[PDB]
Amino acid sequence: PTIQQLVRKGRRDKISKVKTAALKGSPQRRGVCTRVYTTTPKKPNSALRKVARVKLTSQVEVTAYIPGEGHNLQEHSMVLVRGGRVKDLPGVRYKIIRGSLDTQGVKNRKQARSRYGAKKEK
Amino acid sequence: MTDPIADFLTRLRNANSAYHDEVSLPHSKLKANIAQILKNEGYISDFRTEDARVGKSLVIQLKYGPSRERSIAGLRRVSKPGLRVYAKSTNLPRVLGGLGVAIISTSSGLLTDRQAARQGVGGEVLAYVW
RNA sequence: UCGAAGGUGGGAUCGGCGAUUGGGACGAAGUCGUAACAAGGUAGCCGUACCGGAAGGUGCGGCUGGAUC
RNA sequence: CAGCUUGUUGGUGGGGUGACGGCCUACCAAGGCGACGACGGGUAGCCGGCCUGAGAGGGUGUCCGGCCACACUGGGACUGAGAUACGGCCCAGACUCCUACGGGAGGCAGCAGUGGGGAAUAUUGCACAAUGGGCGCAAGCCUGAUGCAGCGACGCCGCGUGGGGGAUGACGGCCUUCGGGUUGUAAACCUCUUUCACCAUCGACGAAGGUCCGGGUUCUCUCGGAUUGACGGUAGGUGGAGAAGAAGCACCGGCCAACUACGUGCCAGCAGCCGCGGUAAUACGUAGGGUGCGAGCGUUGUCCGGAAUUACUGGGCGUAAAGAGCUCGUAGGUGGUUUGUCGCGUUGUUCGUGAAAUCUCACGGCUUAACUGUGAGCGUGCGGGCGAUACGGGCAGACUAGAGUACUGCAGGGGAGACUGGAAUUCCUGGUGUAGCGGUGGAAUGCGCAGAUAUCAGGAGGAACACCGGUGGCGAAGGCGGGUCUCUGGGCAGUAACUGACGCUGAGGAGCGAAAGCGUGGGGAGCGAACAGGAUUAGAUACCCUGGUAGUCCACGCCGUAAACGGUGGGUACUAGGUGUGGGUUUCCUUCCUUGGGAUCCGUGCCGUAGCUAACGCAUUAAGUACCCCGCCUGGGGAGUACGGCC
RNA sequence: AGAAGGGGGACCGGAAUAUCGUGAACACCCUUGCGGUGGGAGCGGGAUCCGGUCGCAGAAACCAGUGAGGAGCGACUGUU
Ligand SMILES: [Mg+2]
Ligand SMILES: [Mg+2]
Ligand SMILES: [Mg+2]
Ligand SMILES: [Mg+2]
Ligand SMILES: [Mg+2]
Ligand SMILES: [Mg+2]
Ligand SMILES: [Mg+2]
Ligand SMILES: [Mg+2]
Ligand SMILES: [Mg+2]
Ligand SMILES: [Mg+2]
Ligand SMILES: [Mg+2]
Ligand SMILES: [Mg+2]
Ligand SMILES: [Mg+2]
Ligand SMILES: [Mg+2]
Ligand SMILES: [Mg+2]
Ligand SMILES: [Mg+2]
Ligand SMILES: [Mg+2]
Ligand SMILES: [Mg+2]
Ligand SMILES: [Mg+2]
Ligand SMILES: [Mg+2]
Ligand SMILES: [Mg+2]
Ligand SMILES: [Mg+2]
Ligand SMILES: [Mg+2]
Ligand SMILES: [Mg+2]
Ligand SMILES: [Mg+2]
Ligand SMILES: [Mg+2]
Ligand SMILES: [Mg+2]
Ligand SMILES: [Mg+2]
Ligand SMILES: [Mg+2]
Ligand SMILES: [Mg+2]
Ligand SMILES: [Mg+2]
Ligand SMILES: [Mg+2]
Ligand SMILES: [Mg+2]
Ligand SMILES: [Mg+2]
Ligand SMILES: [Mg+2]
Ligand SMILES: [Mg+2]
Ligand SMILES: [Mg+2]
Ligand SMILES: [Mg+2]
Ligand SMILES: [Mg+2]
Ligand SMILES: [Mg+2]
Ligand SMILES: [Mg+2]
Ligand SMILES: [Mg+2]
Ligand SMILES: [Mg+2]
Ligand SMILES: [Mg+2]
Ligand SMILES: [Mg+2]
Ligand SMILES: [Mg+2]
Ligand SMILES: [Mg+2]
Ligand SMILES: [Mg+2]
Ligand SMILES: [Mg+2]
Ligand SMILES: [Mg+2]
Ligand SMILES: [Mg+2]
Ligand SMILES: [Mg+2]
Ligand SMILES: [Mg+2]
Ligand SMILES: [Mg+2]
Ligand SMILES: [Mg+2]
Ligand SMILES: [Mg+2]
Ligand SMILES: [Mg+2]
Ligand SMILES: [Mg+2]
Ligand SMILES: [Mg+2]
Ligand SMILES: [Mg+2]
Ligand SMILES: [Mg+2]
Ligand SMILES: [Mg+2]
Ligand SMILES: [Mg+2]
Ligand SMILES: [Mg+2]
Ligand SMILES: [Mg+2]
Ligand SMILES: [Mg+2]
Ligand SMILES: [Mg+2]
Ligand SMILES: [Mg+2]
Ligand SMILES: [Mg+2]
Ligand SMILES: [Mg+2]
Ligand SMILES: [Mg+2]
Ligand SMILES: [Mg+2]
Ligand SMILES: [Mg+2]
Ligand SMILES: [Mg+2]
Ligand SMILES: [Mg+2]
Ligand SMILES: [Mg+2]
Ligand SMILES: [Mg+2]
Secondary structure, eight states: OOHHHHHHSOOOOOOOOOSOTTTSSOSSEEEOOEEEEEEOOOTTTOOOEEEEEEEOTTOOEEEEEOOSSOOOOOSSOOEEEEEOOOSSSSSOOEEEOSSSSSSOOOTTOOSSTTTTOOOOOO | OOOHHHHHHHHHHHHHHTTOSOEEEEOOHHHHHHHHHHHHHTSSOOEEEEEOSSSEEEEEOOOBOSSSOBSOOOOEEOSBTTBOOEEOGGGOOOBGGGTBOEEEEETTEEEOHHHHHHHTOOEEEEEEOO
């Protein structure tokens, strides 16, 4: 509207918020994974989600999510972290890759056999 | 009172919507030329110029079909004073995919889309009459 | 003469931590009240001032986004 | 980030450069840059190109190509036609190393490789066989440029992991209504082919090429004797038995193609959303079945699209987010009718340019494709010449319609100052007069008995102006009526008397601007925040009652905020009617006295046509149809809050 | 706020004979005076630039502010 006013003040695209701040440019960031514990998700879920405090090589501390049936995690551990939303936990915005430098692939895994870590057979 | 071409188009559109059989407005050479183009295109009936109290007034009589049907589907000014619209011969505007007529102001005078494309000279697209 | 580097000095600007402290968001099934939605029990809002555990209350001026004869 | 600059801007005379030039120098002027964003801060190699998108556009600059900048950091000169002079020099700093302690040497952002960081990216290979470059008369030499090879599914393309009969409805598994069906012609069994693998052989084009000889005497040419390929014994061809040597991956609730059972029972768990799991889960793990792709399939990271949720294309602003409180006006944008000129915008042709590859059409070659070659488009543009003035525009004119001025009337709580009036409340004084008054739903606090309430008369004082008074009038908005006088603003009507586009909007900027509040002095009847007592209530920091301070008032300043609302920016043109009111004018019906009806202008209400709207509703006083200008919005909180800045 | 913190300062020569600025003699007109204009002698003053010279030191001896930051109290000059 008002081409003269548009000439005086052009349009501006919406502001953007980045979603990979902790990784800051890396699809996977190598972390430390200290103090593995378990918390409770939001009200209408009533579960016990296994989480951890992992500090990346980019020197940021975030709370990640551990997928699969159980884990071998412990105090500081040689782990890889990828992005992902949990939709139940307050502010967990990253997920640890299962089948990485330290953590093992989820045993007894036969379906989808790539996520959570699973060799075919050998 | 800006863009007398727009005022003329708006008056014609309002009269056509209100089923008026007669319009009156002060006369100008550009409006007379536009009336000539409209008469040639067949969207309107006869037009004439009559001397009012001050200046001259241009008079257009409209045409209606068999029922209360309007030959003029609508009007749309194109080259507004806020932003002028200029078109060349290779990219002349198309109205209704050829079923509409756009007035083109070239060095040969006021011309329609097809006639202007025939002679290959472009200019300012005054409006779409379709 | 100019001239890199270096020294001395007052400033300029951008960050980090900080005893202590203010407000905000979310949590559970806590405590104290019922301010709004009905004329919500004293109609509700808007600007300002003052007061009080808290929501809020009062005055001044305005609106109906309420009613009345 | 609102003020930047002093060789800075210019001039003069010299100096300097290959060359103009404050490039340098001596003197003179005070200038130069800035709201079209200088100066300052953050970020960044630019482009041809690449990705996405129908396009416009949004993202990006990696292969390759063009340029630029750099060579441990910082500075400088020389040689030379030509220097960021990576493998040149001088100096300062850091680092590393040798040393006899006096002193010296060094820079992989060349190829290969090492250490370190990261989720992560490769051989210390061959050859100048071809091309380019440098040195000679050459023969020849060098070339980590280059031509290749080696590693990686890293990306594109292509081919295989077989095929012909098969209901033994293999066995089984699975589901199970115990009947059956699914896996499923795929299998076994009979058979055909050997694509790519394995083994042996031949064997390249790439070289109308370069050397030593024969015609040529050397200039030009073919001829053969010899040799020259890293690739490479490689491509490719041939010969041999054998389906024999070869598939996996993700999903199956809606988006979106794919359901049953087992275990589990808010637990294990999954998930992009919303939703499933707390005892019959097509959503969890598992089994079967299905879907889709394939030597790849899913996740993560980012961009484009869906998103018309930054809208030129292609949005809105009465109530969903959105019109500054109002007005004036700087720049700016935009503009009535008509004549002539220019041809700047506009448009046409022509010429030059717009590198190549890459994008597309059409072909040609690798068995095909990927890949590559050719012809034409692309290269949206720019410069030059030659045509037009239809529109915008420059100039020169003209007109009155816009706008403004003129004259005659009209209405008005428009505003400021000064003087002045009545009612009422309160208070004071005196008279009459005695036991209550006030207050509520009920009371009590309170007042009087020391003479109250009530009644009369007089006086003092401040505030506000009943009736008129309304649906009305005026004002840009806020607002405006007791009366009189003085000064002053604006509007409307009529004549067309005069000028002649002098108009509209208006970033910033400026002025005005309810109530509350602030400063200084005055004033204070009544009301009345705060405060106090009484009453209600569990509590009552309130609603009710009794009081009562600032304030409300005046003078001059300040503050600039309201639901400052028509929740609707200003200006103009057009788009049925019906019915009230206000100010004018106008002929007629002109006495039908009617101050009525009819015509026009300026407003103010309601109802209603078309049209618009999600609806409510708007509807000539638009939220309808168009144009010009300004302001504002991109989910809700956090928040109109923090920091900074102005007052 | 003299915030703080910096730079220069001696002598000789030249610019430089109106260089500049102070006053204004000889000599220049008229209403002749204790008059006016021009004029520039002699005599004093200050500053700057360039070149040179000396020393350990150029404000030369005497003379002549120390400065900054945080609190408490009283506003301040004053009085005891
Ligand atoms: Mg738009
Ligand atoms: Mg702290
Ligand atoms: Mg309540
Ligand atoms: Mg209330
Ligand atoms: Mg109540
Ligand atoms: Mg209430
Ligand atoms: Mg109160
Ligand atoms: Mg209030
Ligand atoms: Mg009120
Ligand atoms: Mg100079
Ligand atoms: Mg010069
Ligand atoms: Mg850079
Ligand atoms: Mg689109
Ligand atoms: Mg450098
Ligand atoms: Mg290095
Ligand atoms: Mg350097
Ligand atoms: Mg040379
Ligand atoms: Mg030279
Ligand atoms: Mg150098
Ligand atoms: Mg070199
Ligand atoms: Mg090197
Ligand atoms: Mg290298
Ligand atoms: Mg790493
Ligand atoms: Mg590492
Ligand atoms: Mg070679
Ligand atoms: Mg060669
Ligand atoms: Mg891989
Ligand atoms: Mg489906
Ligand atoms: Mg079950
Ligand atoms: Mg499942
Ligand atoms: Mg997207
Ligand atoms: Mg878009
Ligand atoms: Mg919208
Ligand atoms: Mg609302
Ligand atoms: Mg709203
Ligand atoms: Mg307003
Ligand atoms: Mg407002
Ligand atoms: Mg406001
Ligand atoms: Mg203007
Ligand atoms: Mg203008
Ligand atoms: Mg015009
Ligand atoms: Mg103009
Ligand atoms: Mg082919
Ligand atoms: Mg090209
Ligand atoms: Mg041309
Ligand atoms: Mg007029
Ligand atoms: Mg007054
Ligand atoms: Mg009194
Ligand atoms: Mg008495
Ligand atoms: Mg009395
Ligand atoms: Mg005239
Ligand atoms: Mg205006
Ligand atoms: Mg303004
Ligand atoms: Mg007030
Ligand atoms: Mg006051
Ligand atoms: Mg006072
Ligand atoms: Mg009390
Ligand atoms: Mg009260
Ligand atoms: Mg009272
Ligand atoms: Mg006060
Ligand atoms: Mg003011
Ligand atoms: Mg108001
Ligand atoms: Mg609008
Ligand atoms: Mg309007
Ligand atoms: Mg309007
Ligand atoms: Mg009316
Ligand atoms: Mg209506
Ligand atoms: Mg609307
Ligand atoms: Mg604020
Ligand atoms: Mg602040
Ligand atoms: Mg000092
Ligand atoms: Mg100080
Ligand atoms: Mg010396
Ligand atoms: Mg002193
Ligand atoms: Mg203190
Ligand atoms: Mg003292
Ligand atoms: Mg004090």
